[PDB]
Amino acid sequence: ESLSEGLVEHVNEVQQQLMKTRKKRPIPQGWATADDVAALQQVAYTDLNVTQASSLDLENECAAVGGLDGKLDIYSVVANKVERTLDIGEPVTATEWTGTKVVIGTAKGWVKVYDAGRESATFQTHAGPVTGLAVHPGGRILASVGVDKSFVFYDLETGERVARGYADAALTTCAFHPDGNLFAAGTQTGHILVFHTTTLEQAESFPLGTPIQALAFSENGFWFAATGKGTSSVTIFDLRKSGAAAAVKELQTGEVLSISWDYTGQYLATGGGTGVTVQMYTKATKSWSEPVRLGMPVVGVKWGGEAKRLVVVSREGVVSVLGKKE
């Protein structure tokens, strides 16, 4: 399916505005310093209601955690409280915030949006599991990908599916470019496919070689990070290059199930079965380092405000906040 002229214009206007915004101030005032990040340690933790946690998203210090047990928990970082449990009744395979609402994907091919505990929109759009979700930075378009090799776009303003594209392989994860006019989907066969958002046409493919487990763009607009199942590293790809030559950096991370690249593009957080890391890119010296390495096994990580907190969750449903102690 194809995008309406009005949605195309929206994507192109959002692209223009987000390009301007990040270039005016790449580093917001008050952001976490390198020493702040290096000093990160656990300052709080609590047991969620969910177990078999699969996915985490964070917005304004509010965490949403979906589980393969068919539950979705909402957790307040600042109140240190589980605020709500939603009984989905299907294993939750992906979780994302859309403004004040939470979107989930399920093992049964459903994408569902919730407004404070109530369904507000549902779509049965995939055959078998939804494997990933991505929220377009304009706040209107939602994307889902599935093992059924398709990716679907939705218009949250109208509550309708608006487009569907197909890949040559089962899809495992996805992400929008920070400016929104590119959409990336990882494949089970080990490639990252990049599509133009308005046309859903594939523009290029990047090789990794293992099923894509996590994917994140940098706010610098030309890098993205990807990691493959069974590997212990993260690869940085340069969108301005092609093929195997586009892999410009390999970072030794251990197993990475989840990546969070902060707004400034300086701090690439990872989490997996052997712990949490932060890989830091220092632009002034064009060099990478690892200020953070902790042992706690996790399945999701997300930067909090100003990258001064990192929120992480284990498969058993323990949410932990890493931050400045005292």
UniProtKB/TrEMBL annotation:
Q: In which pathway does it act?
A: Protein modification; protein ubiquitination
GO terms for biological process, alphabetical: DNA repair; mRNA splicing, via spliceosome; protein K63-linked ubiquitination
- Which reaction is catalysed here? S-ubiquitinyl-[E2 ubiquitin-conjugating enzyme]-L-cysteine + [acceptor protein]-L-lysine = [E2 ubiquitin-conjugating enzyme]-L-cysteine + N(6)-ubiquitinyl-[acceptor protein]-L-lysine
Q: Does the keyword Ribosomal protein apply?
A: no
Q: Name one GO molecular function term.
A: ubiquitin protein ligase activity
Predominant location: nucleus
- UniProt keyword list: Coiled coil, DNA damage, DNA repair, Isomerase, mRNA processing, mRNA splicing, Nucleus, Repeat, Rotamase, Spliceosome, Transferase, Ubl conjugation pathway, WD repeat
Instruction: Name where it's found.
Output: Nucleus
Q: What ranges cover the WD repeats?
A: 123-164
Quote a single Gene Ontology cellular component term. Answer: cytoplasm
Lineage top rank: taxon? Eukaryota
Instruction: Report the enzyme's class at the first EC level.
Output: transferase
Q: What is this enzyme's EC?
A: 2.3.2.27
Tell me, how does this one assemble? Homotetramer.
The UniProt function text for this chain reads: Ubiquitin-protein ligase which is mainly involved pre-mRNA splicing and DNA repair. Required for pre-mRNA splicing as component of the spliceosome.
Please report which protein family the annotation says this sequence is part of: Belongs to the WD repeat PRP19 family.
What name does the UniProt record give this protein?
Answer: Pre-mRNA-processing factor 19
Q: Which residues of the full protein are shown?
A: 154 to 479 of 480
